[PDB]
Amino acid sequence: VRLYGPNFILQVYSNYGRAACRDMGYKNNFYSSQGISLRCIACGVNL
Amino acid sequence: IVGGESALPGAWPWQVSLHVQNVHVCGGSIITPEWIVTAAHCVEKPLNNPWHWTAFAGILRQSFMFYGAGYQVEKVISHPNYDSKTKNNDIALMKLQKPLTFNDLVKPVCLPNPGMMLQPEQLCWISGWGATEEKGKTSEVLNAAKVLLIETQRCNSRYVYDNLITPAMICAGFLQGNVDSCQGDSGGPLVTSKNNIWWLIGDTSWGSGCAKAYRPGVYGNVMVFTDWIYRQMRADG
């Protein structure tokens, strides 16, 4: 539900992938995941 | 933008200029290719009927189209608890009728997640199409500058603003002046660098002139409104 820290960590008050971000905001365009991480959309581009 | 320089066509693809009656009025930022973040004081009651709105992207010099080559805004959502007297909770959202497929010079910026732990005197950047020195005209090219973030305790001093900065707003700039944003830089992306990714933390709301001492810039704190944006995006679908 929530997300904490600069790195992406799934938290609520303390696999699915696209389905996870689906009913959590952005309903499409899932980018990737990691381990410890939900990366819904891509960000951080600079020349 | 005063004291800055014209930004080269690099990679800052999160600035969208809104045009009503074929003239630039306010800017904005994109987070997803279905929504644009902007200030609410420029979308007041006279600015209703979102059909009279168009958006541009990937355009540095403000002469590339006229009554065409733009995106029509479908609906505009503003913050319900907005007060025009004290200028509190000044954030508005606009939805585009086009999918806005990603290409070169087109890439959004992520919303700030709770728990960023930002430094007090952190480094940030501002961008927009405003005046040059004072009460001038609209800048033809896209310019930008570097600003610092000042704390709320020092911003609410008797000699700066005298307790007029609500917890929903943040102060950024220089107390000496010479670097600020003038009229026309509504919305505007206030981004910072952390973990090799840019985060949008501010939103130009108001201010007392530009490039003047003891008068810094006031920006909307999107950290408080992060949940409202998610709620609106969830209720839209």
Add this chain to the structure above:
Amino acid sequence: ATVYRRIPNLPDCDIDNWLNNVSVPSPLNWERRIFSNCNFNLSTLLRLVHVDSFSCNNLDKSKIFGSCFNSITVDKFAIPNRRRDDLQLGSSGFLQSSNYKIDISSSSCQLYYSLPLVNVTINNFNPSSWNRRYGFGSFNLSSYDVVYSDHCFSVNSDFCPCADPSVVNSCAKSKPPSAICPAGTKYRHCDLDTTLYVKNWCRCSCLPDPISTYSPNTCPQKKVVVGIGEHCPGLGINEEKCGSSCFCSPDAFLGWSFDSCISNNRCNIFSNFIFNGINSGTTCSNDLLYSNTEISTVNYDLYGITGQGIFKEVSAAYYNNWQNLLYDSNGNIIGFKDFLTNKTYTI
């Protein structure tokens, strides 16, 4: 075995009389006196003054005895007990930054001496011109207390800690006091501005104080560091407490502190000797030629006459005020008079 007597052509310097003076200036004053065309004796000077420490820089004490200089300048001031460590050769302390700067690229000697607390007074005078122009009086401190500055400021001739009262009438928040500024000086820069709904909000410069200000580039009072041989141009003035004529309150002056100078029931004073030109001039030392000065009843150099002989204690009354040698018709010398002991000898 060498008797050397000669009448000097120049008077004595009398440095001890100026060092042991009853008036001791504060570090903000540091009075200066230049000694030239005179003779001095370092041993007598160090004996008649209660010396605690004496060191030299870029010069040795051995070459002082018997050397001639063009001029000698001496600077003196009392030492606060707090800032005694700031007087070292090279230090970013309050004293060497605001009151007195010690030059490192010159031949100088530092002297620390003491003076009895009886019949001694400390003069605390502000040498600032623009401070006394707007109503600065005295510090009004207790006895045996010296004043030193930690932040010194400088302003142009066009300066006035005062606003034009005609403009200040249209103010509601932070209305500064105003008065009539003398002609030839601009008024305090204040402007009327509205933030969101406050119509009468007047903003001025130098806030909150010139010492800790948010915009140093907009305040006319600017910080400065004293140079070689310069006093502090002036202290900071709180423009919010100034203002008929613009008369600032005595409590509106910031950037000064004080401390006692009593150590072992005595007052400590700093002294700096600067020697201008070596191996030249007419300011020489008498230490080498006055080593013994005792005639045992032997080569003699008596008033330019050289030779050898003997001496005896005789009673002679034929010597006038200008006469010192006794000659015979043949052209030889058979006696002389000593101008140091008033005794006559026969050769």
Add this chain to the structure above:
Amino acid sequence: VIGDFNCTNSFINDYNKTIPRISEDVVDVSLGLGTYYVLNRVYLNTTLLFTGYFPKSGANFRDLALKGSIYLSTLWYKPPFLSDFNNGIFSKVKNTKLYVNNTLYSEFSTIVIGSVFVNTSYTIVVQPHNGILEITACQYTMCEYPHTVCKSKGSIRNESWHIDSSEPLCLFKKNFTYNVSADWLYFHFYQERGVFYAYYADVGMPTTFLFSLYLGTILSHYYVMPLTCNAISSNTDNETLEYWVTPLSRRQYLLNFDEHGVITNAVDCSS
């Protein structure tokens, strides 16, 4: 024209009728007038044949005293007033006594001896201060038109004979005292082999040794600067300024000393 500094040009004109006078008296060394004691030597019951610098017996003096009220003449700073210092001079000075509220003041003119009178060379100045003689040998920056101001009754001008912000380099500096109630004063100045000698006396008697100084250079010119006084003329009180000068030459004399070393009589070997 003595110096090269422009210090004052308030009242400067070209006077035409200032000529020095020649005295009616002559030099008489029989009783000892015109002779000087040795530097610091004492002679008892002796007859000394001394070869020194003495004036000629029977020579006449000339007055070089200048007194002005408001205006100063440019011809007063040119010859014959700017004379040559070949070997030495013997000066006969008159002590002018002025009364202000029944008290006595002593005033007379001052003399300057030098070479070019610039701050690159040394000059000798002898100035009296109400009974105190001030003798200094410094690198003074002399002015073009120097003068002395009366301090007893004041004057219309200000004292200006040298302009120096700082203290110049001096080789000699000492103060001497004389008798205020005296009538005539006598001085002896001469030089040999780069050494300068000076003598003085307040009574009628052989002169008294003052000092000696080694310079290394040759002194060529001497000048007696004018004195600006308020009331010294035949209008308020009949007083005058006199400064008689006679040249000195290397002669041979015979001096007789008594039991107490006092000169009794002197005979010039050349009649």
